[PDB]
Amino acid sequence: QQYECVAEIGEGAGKVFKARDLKNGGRFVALKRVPLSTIREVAVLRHLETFEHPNVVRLFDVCTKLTLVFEHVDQDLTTYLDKVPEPGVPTETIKDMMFQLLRGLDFLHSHRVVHRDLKPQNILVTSSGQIKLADFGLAVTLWYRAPEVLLQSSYATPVDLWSVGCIFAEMFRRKPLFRGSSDVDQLGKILDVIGLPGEEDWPRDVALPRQAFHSAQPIEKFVTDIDELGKDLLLKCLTFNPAKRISAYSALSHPYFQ
Numbered sequence: 001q002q003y004e005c006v007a008e009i010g011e012g013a014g015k016v017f018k019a020r021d022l023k024n025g026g027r028f029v030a031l032k033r034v035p036l037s038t039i040r041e042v043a044v045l046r047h048l049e050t051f052e053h054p055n056v057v058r059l060f061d062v063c064t065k066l067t068l069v070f071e072h073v074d075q076d077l078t079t080y081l082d083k084v085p086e087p088g089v090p091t092e093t094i095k096d097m098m099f100q101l102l103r104g105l106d107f108l109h110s111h112r113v114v115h116r117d118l119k120p121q122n123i124l125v126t127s128s129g130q131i132k133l134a135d136f137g138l139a140v141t142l143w144y145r146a147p148e149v150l151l152q153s154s155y156a157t158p159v160d161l162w163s164v165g166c167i168f169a170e171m172f173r174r175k176p177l178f179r180g181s182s183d184v185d186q187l188g189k190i191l192d193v194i195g196l197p198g199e200e201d202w203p204r205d206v207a208l209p210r211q212a213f214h215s216a217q218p219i220e221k222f223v224t225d226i227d228e229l230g231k232d233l234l235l236k237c238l239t240f241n242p243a244k245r246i247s248a249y250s251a252l253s254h255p256y257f258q
């Protein structure tokens with residue numbers, strides 16, 4: 001094959017490797033090796049590539065079980081936070097990274113792709129500080145799961161803005177905001193902070209009823225340095241109700257990004 005594995009990046013639900021692209025100057029690429037639904041998902045990927053959005057990982061090739069060649073990025077958001085000098089991330093650097101993050105999200109929503117598992121472990125940061133979304137559009141941590149996914153009720157795009165707020169926060173905290181040991185625990189951790197939602201905000205026909213939990217806390221506690229504009233925006237990303245939750249397109253126009 002034209003490529004040559006030099007290491008593994010990680011494994012999960014598939015397998016991703018770091019390699020050399022021998023035909024293109026020995027640059028680093030990323031190889032993943034994984035039925036119409038599959039053909040379908042790849043058709044979308046190939047399609048999304050055409051637009052070449054700066055805030056999503058480039059697709060270089062699809063080898064004919066199935067190998068997908070993407071670009072390689074030196075690090076993810078997680079190692080960027082581990083290795084970040086004290087006492088954190090420059091307010092301005094957060095404001096910028098979030099924007100780039102929201103850009104690719106709107107780009108993905110606008111084409112009706114839902115990431116479904118957006119966590120800092122697949123948010124890639126390049127040499128220049130360019131955010132690039134990885135690990136999407138193909139078939140451990142619930143800390144970034146949205147309430148409705150936890151309740152197993154709605155699976156639409158509002159899911160990924162819940163994750164955005166969770167990441168937004170962590171960019172201040174440098175530690176995950178809600179660390180739960182399981183789906184019920186997780187759901188608890190969330191409601192301890194945002195407060196019990198209105199009774200009509202609980203989706204119907206879900207095994208978990210509103211009565212199985214027990215008041216809202218102020219946000220500046222768990223997240224310090226956050227401005228009013230950060231606060232307000234962050235609150236509309238973590239609205240319990242997916243219909244009341246903000247959207248990427250709507251987020252891009254928040255006063256916070258002025």
Ligand SMILES: CN(C)C1CCN(c2ccc3[nH]c(C(=O)c4ccnc(-c5cncc6ccccc56)c4)nc3n2)CC1
Pocket residue numbers: 009014016029030032057070071072073074075076079121122123124134135136
């Ligand atoms: C200490 N060592 C182990 C550190 C080396 C630097 N580092 C990373 C981490 C993630 C990284 N992704 C990448 C990529 O280039 C890349 C490009 C396109 N798609 C993916 C991708 C595809 N499918 C599923 C995925 C699931 C999660 C994340 C990415 C996925 C990855 N390079 C990374 N380098 C941290 C550990």
